[PDB]
Structure 1
Amino acid sequence: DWGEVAENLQEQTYNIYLTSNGTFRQDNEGNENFNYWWNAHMLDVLIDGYERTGDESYLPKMKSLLEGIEVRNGNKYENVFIDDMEWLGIACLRTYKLTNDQQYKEVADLLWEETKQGWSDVHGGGIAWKTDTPNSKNACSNGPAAIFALYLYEIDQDEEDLEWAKKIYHWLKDTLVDPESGLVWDNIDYHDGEAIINRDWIFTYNVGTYIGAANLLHQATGEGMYLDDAIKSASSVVAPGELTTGGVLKNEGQGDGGLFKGILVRYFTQLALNPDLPDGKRNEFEEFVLFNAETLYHNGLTSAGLAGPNWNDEPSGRVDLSTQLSGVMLMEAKALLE
């Protein structure tokens, strides 16, 4: 069953990438480089496993990871990459909602304060990409920020957190979202004195976090406009276009790009579980997840359980942790859809 596929990928990922301090190394060829936001998504994958199985063995692995991230980041959680902080904050609030472990909440609160400090009037709003790159406002430092704020609002029910979610999402939609397709451009930045939007870089995980934010805003407010937003973006993901090759989410390389597919699948799946989704869209989205899962399972996984950047070809060399996490995420999402 899909659950057993996901469990096997979980075990393989853990054993191949485990390294010092309960964190996870950059690749399977001995590169020990610490990648903060990849390890945040490893936390996300471990939570996926815990939620599926209820197996208590996930909990020490999660906790060690949380603490190891702090150590390998220089004995602090703050990072000059603001998107990094947002991703870890999301994982921490997910875990808090599931375990009530206050250590995760305290980390998330620190990171939320860091995140808000990244907002500025450059380009009319939005959270900066990095604390030393204030003039770049990126989909990956805003979509996740809106999700982070929505999890915080769901938990502490402080209205200022929903205010923040709405502010962030409104700026994102106005600036970086194509009004017709709902695809999401990577960033707006100043280059040689002038403001440029990179429309060439349409990445899976940016439309993914836009969908995720839209879906959570729908759940936080009830307003159908958010669900319509989510549906338009997701429908453009399913239909043939820039993000698919033969009905399969495209190869976006390794390194950071290796993780992009998995993040889209995560939030795509959360949309498909939205109770107010029309039945036809639900069936279509579930089918899309199944088709990608089948394709990776039969054509992309090496015998040892490693997924490559192209879910249709087995990798023959280095596999970065990010790439592998995307495969694990797809399988956990399929299992979640039963």
Structure 2
Amino acid sequence: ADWGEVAENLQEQTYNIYLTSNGTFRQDNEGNENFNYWWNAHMLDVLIDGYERTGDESYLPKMKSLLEGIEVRNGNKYENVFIAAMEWLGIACLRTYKLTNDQQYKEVADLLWEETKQGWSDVHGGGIAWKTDTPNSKNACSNGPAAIFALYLYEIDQDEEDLEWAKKIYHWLKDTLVDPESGLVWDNIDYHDGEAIINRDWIFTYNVGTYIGAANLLHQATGEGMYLDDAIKSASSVVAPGELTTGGVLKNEGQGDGGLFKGILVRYFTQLALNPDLPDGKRNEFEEFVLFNAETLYHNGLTSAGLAGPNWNDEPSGRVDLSTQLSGVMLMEAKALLE
């Protein structure tokens, strides 16, 4: 079984176990049919991964049923009070539009982009708010994805205003939430009792992952070497022993939201690994890091059926949330893409 076949087996198991009403995916493989908007946005990204790997046109109807189901199970609308939810679906919509030219995806993305920009304010000097409800909380997870969103939109529409947005968001993110020594990414800045407080304890895989993804896309959009340097510094900190790994493997971040975090990192990490201006030596290091994570999950973390747990070193003994399964599928599709 080569890495493409492993990826296809995890795509099949995910669809089989989690497919529910309206072509959307359920919260867990046990008693929870809750609709989780951003988790289903990452399921769309996973189906696109399968389509790109296979060229199999049977993915396209699955993608379209999921796009339409999200609107139904979110209450017959695409708006969400969580701004990052709208950013993650926007990214998947523009990715699909680039591959299929299906205008329905572009129209949903255009809507979600207007809502995302409304979240920007000069509180803490910039940044998109986490929620339409929490305008003091500026979070890495509502900024890194907004920069990626703007860069995908720039690739499609070639409007200078979208590149301006990407640069402004990235500049604020790097000036506020990026460790200048490591290039790892702090979770948020918020007010408490008159003080601006940065949460430096919460260093999560997906926040450094979207910073790496934005930096990689900015390098490709501008040619400015500072962006590729930033991406390489952050990625080198992900591979070197430290906060995000245990025994050379991306660490257990629990289930729920945290279950998706590692998958997002692997996706953009892998995109940096495919940048043709990346030095050959760094490319070998990054490709080997992805392979050892993929091998670890395949041999030690996956159940016989092909469900991944939060710990890629251990099989899960009970419930597996969709988020956790998606991280597993994203890892295998990234490995298959590097082959």
- Give TM-score, length-normalised by structure 1: 1.00
Alpha-carbon distance between aligned partners in 2 of 1:192 and 1:293, rounded to the nearest angstrom:
45
Alpha-carbon distance between aligned partners in 2 of 1:254 and 1:196, rounded to the nearest angstrom:
26
Q: After the TM superposition, which of the residue ranges 190-199 and 309-318 deviates more from structure 2?
A: 190-199
Deviation per residue, 1:101-136 (Å, 9 max, x gap): 000000000000000000001100010000001100
Following superposition, the deviation at residue 181 of structure 1 comes to 0.2
Following superposition, the deviation at residue 313 of structure 1 comes to 0.2
Alpha-carbon distance between aligned partners in 2 of 1:266 and 1:24, rounded to the nearest angstrom:
20
Alpha-carbon distance between aligned partners in 2 of 1:204 and 1:176, rounded to the nearest angstrom:
14
Alpha-carbon distance between aligned partners in 1 of 2:282 and 2:44, rounded to the nearest angstrom:
30
Deviation per residue, 1:267-293 (Å, 9 max, x gap): 000000000000000000000000000
Following superposition, the deviation at residue 193 of structure 1 comes to 3.1
Following superposition, the deviation at residue 15 of structure 1 comes to 0.8
1:210 counterpart residue number: 211
What is the correspondence of 1:185-334 to structure 2 with a 5 Å cutoff? 185-334=186-335
Following superposition, the deviation at residue 246 of structure 1 comes to 0.4
Alpha-carbon distance between aligned partners in 1 of 2:10 and 2:145, rounded to the nearest angstrom:
25
What is the correspondence of 1:146-157 to structure 2 with a 5 Å cutoff? 146-157=147-158
Deviation per residue, 1:286-337 (Å, 9 max, x gap): 0000000000000000001100000000000000000000000000000000
Alpha-carbon distance between aligned partners in 2 of 1:53 and 1:127, rounded to the nearest angstrom:
36
- Give TM-score, length-normalised by structure 2: 0.99
Alpha-carbon distance between aligned partners in 1 of 2:152 and 2:325, rounded to the nearest angstrom:
26
SS in 1 for 2:197: strand
Runs of 4+ in 1 over 6 A off after TM superposition: none
SS in 2 for 1:133: coil
SS in 2 for 1:189: strand
2:140 counterpart residue number: 139
Alpha-carbon distance between aligned partners in 1 of 2:236 and 2:160, rounded to the nearest angstrom:
31
SS in 1 for 2:320: coil
2:185 counterpart residue number: 184
Alpha-carbon distance between aligned partners in 2 of 1:41 and 1:30, rounded to the nearest angstrom:
21
Following superposition, the deviation at residue 192 of structure 1 comes to 3.0
Provide structure 2 residue ranges, at least 5 long, that are not aligned to the other structure. none
Alpha-carbon distance between aligned partners in 1 of 2:300 and 2:22, rounded to the nearest angstrom:
34
Following superposition, the deviation at residue 97 of structure 1 comes to 0.2
Provide structure 1 residue ranges, at least 5 long, that are not aligned to the other structure. none
Following superposition, the deviation at residue 72 of structure 1 comes to 0.5
Following superposition, the deviation at residue 191 of structure 1 comes to 1.9
Following superposition, the deviation at residue 195 of structure 1 comes to 1.1
Residue 338 of structure 2 corresponds to residue 337 of structure 1: yes
CA-atom RMSD in angstroms: 0.4
1:120 counterpart residue number: 121
Residue-pair matches, total:
338
SS in 2 for 1:190: strand
Alpha-carbon distance between aligned partners in 2 of 1:57 and 1:25, rounded to the nearest angstrom:
21
Alpha-carbon distance between aligned partners in 2 of 1:86 and 1:329, rounded to the nearest angstrom:
18
Q: After the TM superposition, which of the residue ranges 191-200 and 237-246 deviates more from structure 2?
A: 191-200
Alpha-carbon distance between aligned partners in 1 of 2:125 and 2:27, rounded to the nearest angstrom:
36
1:66 counterpart residue number: 67
Deviation per residue, 1:183-237 (Å, 9 max, x gap): 0000001123321100000000000000000000000000000000000000000
SS in 2 for 1:128: coil
1:46 counterpart residue number: 47
SS in 2 for 1:130: coil
Following superposition, the deviation at residue 166 of structure 1 comes to 0.1
SS in 1 for 2:29: coil
SS in 2 for 1:74: coil
Alpha-carbon distance between aligned partners in 1 of 2:194 and 2:312, rounded to the nearest angstrom:
40
Alpha-carbon distance between aligned partners in 2 of 1:268 and 1:108, rounded to the nearest angstrom:
24
Following superposition, the deviation at residue 242 of structure 1 comes to 0.5
Alpha-carbon distance between aligned partners in 2 of 1:179 and 1:254, rounded to the nearest angstrom:
30
Alpha-carbon distance between aligned partners in 2 of 1:55 and 1:83, rounded to the nearest angstrom:
30
